[PDB]
Each structure stands twice: as C-alpha cells, then as structure tokens.
Write a protein that binds this ligand. Structure first.
Ligand SMILES: */C(=C/C(=O)OCC)[C@H](C[C@@H]1CCNC1=O)NC(=O)[C@H](Cc1ccccc1)NC(=O)CC(C)C
Length: 181
C-alpha cells in the first residue's frame, strides 16, 4: 500500500469519528489527549454520541478571532480514558494551502468516505447561513449536507475542517496548530 492511502486510512482509524449532536450527523477530528474539534454549528451539548456510545463533554470552546468573528470551530474536551493518537505535528503552524487534497468524511450515513476535492486555496471571509466567518479556505467541489466536520488532508497534513458549500464549491475552516496548544 502507498503512503498517501496509508495516511488517510490511519487517520480514519485513529482520529476521525462518527458523531451525532442534536443538530444531526457530523465527522469529529480527535487531535490529542482528550481534545477533539467539531464545526461550531454542530452545537454539541453536555453529551455527544460518539460511534456507539454517549460521551460526556467536559468543556467546549467556540473559537473566534481578534475581531470577535466566528471561526466555525469548537474545541471539546471529552470524559474518556482514550487519548487520541497525537496528530498536532501534521497540522501546520499557519493555515496553509495544498494541491490535490482529499476530504476524509466519517459519519453513520457516510462512513469512511473519501472525496477528492482538488486544490485547496485561501478564501478568507465566508457568509455561512447568515454568520460571517473568517479564516476559511475553498475547493471547487460540490460538497453536500452531511459532510461537515470532514478533515481536509494532503501529503500527511491536516489542514482544515469542512464547514459549508454553495452547491458548486466547498469551504473549510482552516487549521493551525496553536488552536490545539
Ligand atoms: C454541513 C452541515 C450540515 O449538513 O447541516 C445542514 C443540514 C453543511 C455542508 C453544506 C450544505 C450544502 N453543501 C455543503 O457543503 N454546512 C452547512 O449547511 C452550513 C450550515 C450552517 C448554517 C448556519 C450557521 C452555520 C452553518 N451552510 C452552508 O454550507 C451554506 C453556505 C456556506 C452559506
């Protein structure tokens, strides 16, 4: 097996989970220790369903920038014995572009799904169903409902979390390492 396929499969196995909030089905990225990230609009409560069991959420942090604008990410600390394989070193220090990215989705409805979204470019501002949102990137792929939380990936790097689309193109919140420090 090749190194690209090995990386995404290993991510799927060790770090990318099927979850459900009151808002419905999402892919969750497990970053390190008890720390995971979801799209903000998933609105995780005091518990979240994670693959086959209800998990207590110990804390939730909605990320905003300096201007107070939505970044569309929520950091959650889970009450579990597992520590996620630590993938922070695959997350760039700054929000970074990629060629030929792959979007890795893992939901009950869309399990272990690989979507070849193409190149990922800087986008910046996005209007997200009324909510202004900063620090996003774009791929010209017609992403759909159900794929939020999907992990944008390329050459052993974890660069974004899928957050929306307009029927023609798709948008991720960009990842930087310092959100997980
Ligand atoms: C991901 C969440 C989802 O499935 O829930 C809606 C039922 C979704 C992916 C989108 C849908 C169409 N194509 C996609 O890639 N994201 C959203 O639906 C965004 C929902 C949202 C609403 C209010 C606040 C935050 C997020 N909205 C969009 O993708 C629409 C445009 C970016 C404006």
């Amino acid at each position: 097996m090749g190194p690209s396929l090995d990386f995404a499969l290993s991510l799927l196995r060790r770090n990318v989970r099927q979850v459900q909030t009151d808002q419905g089905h999402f892919t969750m990225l497990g970053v390190r220790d008890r720390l995971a990230v979801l799209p903000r609009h998933s609105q995780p409560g005091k518990t979240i369903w994670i693959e086959h069991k209800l998990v207590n959420i110990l804390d939730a942090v909605e990320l905003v920038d300096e201007q107070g604008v939505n970044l569309e990410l929520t950091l959650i600390t889970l009450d579990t014995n597992e520590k996620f394989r630590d993938i922070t070193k695959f997350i760039p220090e700054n929000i970074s572009t990629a060629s030929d990215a792959t979007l890795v989705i893992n939901t009950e409805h869309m399990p272990s799904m690989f979507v070849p979204v193409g190149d990922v470019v800087q986008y910046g501002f996005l209007n997200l169903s009324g909510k202004p949102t900063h620090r996003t990137m774009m791929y010209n792929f017609p992403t759909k409902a159900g794929q939020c939380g999907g992990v944008v990936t390329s050459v052993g790097k974890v660069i974004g979390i899928h957050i929306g689309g307009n029927g023609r193109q798709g948008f991720c919140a960009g990842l930087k390492r310092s959100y997980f420090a």
